[PDB]
Amino acid sequence: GTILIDLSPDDKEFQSVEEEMQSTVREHRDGGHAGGIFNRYNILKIQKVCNKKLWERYTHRRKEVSEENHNHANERMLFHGSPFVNAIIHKGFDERHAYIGGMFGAGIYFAENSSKSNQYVYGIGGGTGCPVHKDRSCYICHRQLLFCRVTLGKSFLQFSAMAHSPPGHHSVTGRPSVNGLALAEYVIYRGEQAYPEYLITYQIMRPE
Numbered sequence: 578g579t580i581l582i583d584l585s586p587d588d589k590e591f592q593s594v595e596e597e598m599q600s601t602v603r604e605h606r607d608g609g610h611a612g613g614i615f616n617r618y619n620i621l622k623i624q625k626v627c628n629k630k631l632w633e634r635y636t637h638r639r640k641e642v643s644e645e646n647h648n649h650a651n652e653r654m655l656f657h658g659s660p661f662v663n664a665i666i667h668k669g670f671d672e673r674h675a676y677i678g679g680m681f682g683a684g685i686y687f688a689e690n691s692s693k694s695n696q697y698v699y700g701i702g703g704g705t706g707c708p709v710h711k712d713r714s715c716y717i718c719h720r721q722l723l724f725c726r727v728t729l730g731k732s733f734l735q736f737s738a739m740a741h742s743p744p745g746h747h748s749v750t751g752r753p754s755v756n757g758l759a760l761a762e763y764v765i766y767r768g769e770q771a772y773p774e775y776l777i778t779y780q781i782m783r784p785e
């Protein structure tokens with residue numbers, strides 16, 4: 578039941594999604610090893626992901642969280658990079674996508690920095706890079722990220738350098754406590770607490 582609607586680069590919606598993508602690029606502590614060396618992207622396409630069943634699954638759960646948190650879903654828009662992006666847009670997030678080795682336990686992880694989600698597009702640590710060249714820094718091959726609606730509810734705040742949520746909480750927030758430039762990362766433990774709203778197709782750009 579998934580359909581993808583292509584947005585025009587003239588559309589304000591394309592533009593505000595592009596801006597969020599481009600403006601949350603940062604340098605990473607690995608010097609580019611996982612996700613490649615770049616300061617910005619070439620945005621090739623932005624598609625709206627439309628699936629009635631997945632949307633209703635998302636809003637049903639949002640209402641539950643809201644009602645357990647003084648009518649505040651604490652909804653954010655966050656990036657998700659994954660080798661399983663094609664399965665996610667068709668079937669939704671589920672316990673199979675649970676990053677077991679994640680630092681906040683086995684859940685589904687999201688990032689405020691697009692360049693952070695970019696590190697996981699070809700797998701954990703960037704895997705072996707792109708299918709075609711085995712290059713984690715490939716400037717040629719098309720990459721995809723999701724920009725997702727994520728319900729955080731009452732988020733457990735973790736300071737720092739499928740399982741269950743900590744009791745009394747709907748999510749975990751990873752607050753950076755060393756790298757002053759890094760933005761937050763988040764984890765949910767229920768697939769229904771995120772909806773994959775925009776599929777972004779892009780290349781990383783070789784710096785001048």
Ligand SMILES: O=c1[nH]c(N2CCN(Cc3ccncc3)CC2)nc2c1CCCC2
Pocket residue numbers: 656657658659660673674675676677686687688693694695697700701762763
């Ligand atoms: O976008 C992300 N994707 C992911 N992943 C998406 C893909 N997951 C694929 C996977 C899941 C379970 N086993 C092996 C590979 C790995 C974790 N992790 C993070 C982020 C952003 C914040 C940092 C953690």
Ligand SMILES: [Zn+2]
Pocket residue numbers: 707708709710711712715716717718
């Ligand atoms: Zn390549």
